[PDB]
Write a protein that binds this ligand. Structure first.
Ligand SMILES: Nc1ncnc2c1ncn2[C@@H]1O[C@H](COP(=O)(O)OC(=O)[C@@H](N)Cc2c[nH]c3ccccc23)[C@@H](O)[C@H]1O
Ligand SMILES: Nc1ncnc2c1ncn2[C@@H]1O[C@H](COP(=O)(O)OC(=O)[C@@H](N)Cc2c[nH]c3ccccc23)[C@@H](O)[C@H]1O
Lengths: 374, 369
């Protein structure tokens, strides 16, 4: 399994605490998202600075991204985006979303820019369909927005030796120079000068991410000091596991470990019933006696990510732990929850117009520009 | 010295020939510029393809550039630009000019972007003051125009291993990744898809340059094949030597080997009289007997670049008094430099801005090739 504690201490982060949560709830006048309460988003750098800044200036922005390497995203890919939806609503601040189409063109030898773009456009619909607030969201493709990033990229480039790049990201001498140079493009949007149409200069940036993105942003913090700009504030998520077991990451038969957003209710039912690891007894008699293992049961673990009502989760968790609820029942609860989530997602996605989509790419929205001088 | 013949064969170029010149004169209905006639621009790749292309389609574009590393350029820096002025007039085609401010920011550790920009703006005036046709010219700064270049840069990046970049340009592991990645930005404008406001896609590109730029464009030709786009056509110039001697390059006490465009008539006179190498005899008696060495005399060599009238040059060349030939050069330089400064001083913000406008109708002539 992934020892997340050993990552905190090795990468140099701090755990998000109960007092961080209360503080957040005080500043946003709203219950904190379950991801924070339940330790999904569990780690940070400079969170207190950010919260202090928001308290004084009612102002920061949120940055996250998606590398369009596949036509259809899975549930794990949406964790950061659901969290950004919450952050955006609760704090009432802009959210900027990078589609690193350059990255995925550069890293996949047989993929054309044209092919990457079909993936990007579909991915963007999936991203929008989580319910992002169009009025406070700016999505951009690096292939189209590089002109705005480049001056900042130049400064980041200048402050990154080839040695550092190769060491931090594990590049070798046969890698193309696009790969060597991409990380500066992922780092750039942490600096509000990249969005002059709607942000003031040197506004703090909150960067929600799965823990795999940290090498970029750990580097970004060193470079920020050299640029005399705010260090990016990071909050890291654990990985949502695959169905096969908790000691894994949901990734991409191998698609039987993954819930795709294009999956039908039929396919979801079958994946859960047949492939989702059960933490219960092998017999009903044994289950009644020993109970369910919550740490290993995939359906319970998934319910931690998806079920908004705390009481309902603790009710299910206690019954399953005690043996009062069967593996068949908890799997059935998950399926109903997933089916609802996925059907709502597809309903929203199908309904998106070109006009609605294009609006997310418009940097001159008045609601976005409220922080332009702020 | 620089053995230019050994470069041709090592880099893989071909010499420009008399038949290339005649061919050019036939197609442009105009005498060829002295740089070609006198072997200043001496080397090329795919020149015949370009000339044939122009004959069939009356269409190509010219690309060259300047790295703004100094507040004022010297005469050597203008050689390519004078030549582009001619090419632009003679062929009646667009000229695009890259200011590689990104390059010079990235290669000079103590230079800020803000400092580079003061240099760029001054350099741009120097470039314009050569007499470029504003109606057929597009100047751009990489810091401002990168959005238009990036898709093409990505493809060039993808087709360049770190090994290649390091080999071709001599980078090491302590160089910043900006340096490693810059060459693709220098290469990109060779592909007309970078100028969608005024060029059609996949239009041939003629790239005049001093021979030091060739590593970029030799690479650009290999990559062009992989991108299934036209290979850039190159024409290379020798270096205008420094005053110290012919075995040199004029390069930005060490400024006594260089004629800057900000130099006064007083400073020019002194640099020539005091520092310009003389190919005359050491004694007056010896000079009478052997004559001047034209191959080594800096003042004669400079006159090959600057004197437009062939007869006047051949008259001076046959006769060759070191004091007199130096005095001829000084008058020629002083005129050139004073005209240049006159023009430069006269440039308005409006005139300058116009060069950066990609939507000029005269520029859009080839938009639908
Ligand atoms: N099983 C999982 N459970 C929870 N989270 C997960 C899971 N799998 C992936 N993630 C997170 O989803 C985001 C997008 O992943 P990508 O591979 O597109 O991610 C990429 O290819 C990036 N280079 C794109 C990017 C560009 N700029 C950014 C800024 C912040 C974060 C990400 C980016 C990521 O945050 C990732 O950590
Ligand atoms: N003594 C000399 N005699 C004759 N030619 C000379 C002499 N010194 C310099 N040159 C030529 O001047 C141009 C600009 O030089 P830079 O160092 O700014 O050149 C640079 O720093 C480039 N990276 C800028 C650039 C960007 N794109 C281009 C495309 C073509 C040519 C040049 C560029 C060059 O053509 C150079 O060969």
């Amino acid at each position: 399994g992934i020892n997340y504690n050993k990552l905190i201490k090795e990468f140099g982060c701090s755990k998000i605490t109960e007092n961080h949560i209360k503080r957040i709830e005080k500043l946003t006048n709203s219950k904190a998202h379950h991801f924070i309460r339940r330790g999904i988003f569990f780690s940070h750098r400079d969170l207190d600075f950010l919260l202090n800044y928001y308290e004084q200036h009612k102002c920061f922005y949120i940055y996250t991204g998606r590398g369009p390497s596949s036509l259809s995203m899975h549930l794990g890919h949406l964790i950061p985006f659901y969290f950004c939806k919450y952050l955006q609503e609760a704090f009432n601040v802009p959210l900027v979303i990078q589609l690193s189409d350059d990255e995925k063109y550069l890293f996949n030898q047989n993929y054309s820019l044209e092919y990457i773009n079909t993936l990007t456009n579909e991915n963007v619909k999936d991203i929008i369909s989580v319910g992002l607030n169009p009025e406070l969201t700016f999505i951009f493709k690096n292939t189209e927005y590089a002109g705005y990033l480049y001056p900042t990229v130049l400064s980041i480039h200048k402050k990154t030796t080839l040695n550092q790049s190769m060491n931090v990201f594990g590049f070798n001498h046969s890698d193309n120079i696009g790969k060597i140079s991409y990380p500066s493009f992922q780092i750039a949007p942490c600096f509000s000068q990249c969005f002059p149409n709607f942000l003031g200069k040197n506004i703090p940036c909150l960067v929600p991410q799965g823990i795999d993105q940290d090498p970029y942003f750990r580097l970004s913090r060193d470079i920020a000091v050299k640029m005399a700009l705010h260090k990016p504030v990071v909050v890291h998520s654990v990985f949502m596991p695959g169905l096969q077991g908790v000691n894994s990451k949901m990734s991409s038969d191998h698609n039987n470990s993954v819930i795709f957003l294009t999956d039908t209710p039929e396919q979801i039912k079958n994946k859960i019933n047949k492939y989702a690891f059960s933490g219960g007894g092998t017999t009903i008699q044994e289950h009644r006696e020993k109970g369910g293992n919550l740490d290993k049961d995939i359906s319970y673990q998934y319910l931690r990510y998806l079920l908004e009502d705390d009481n309902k989760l603790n009710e299910i968790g206690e019954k399953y732990k005690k043996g009062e609820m069967l593996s068949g029942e908890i799997k059935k609860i998950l399926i109903d929850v997933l089916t609802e989530l996925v059907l709502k997602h597809q309903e929203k996605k199908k309904s998106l117009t070109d006009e609605e989509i294009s609006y997310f790419f418009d940097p001159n929205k008045p609601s976005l520009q409220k922080f332009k001088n702020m």
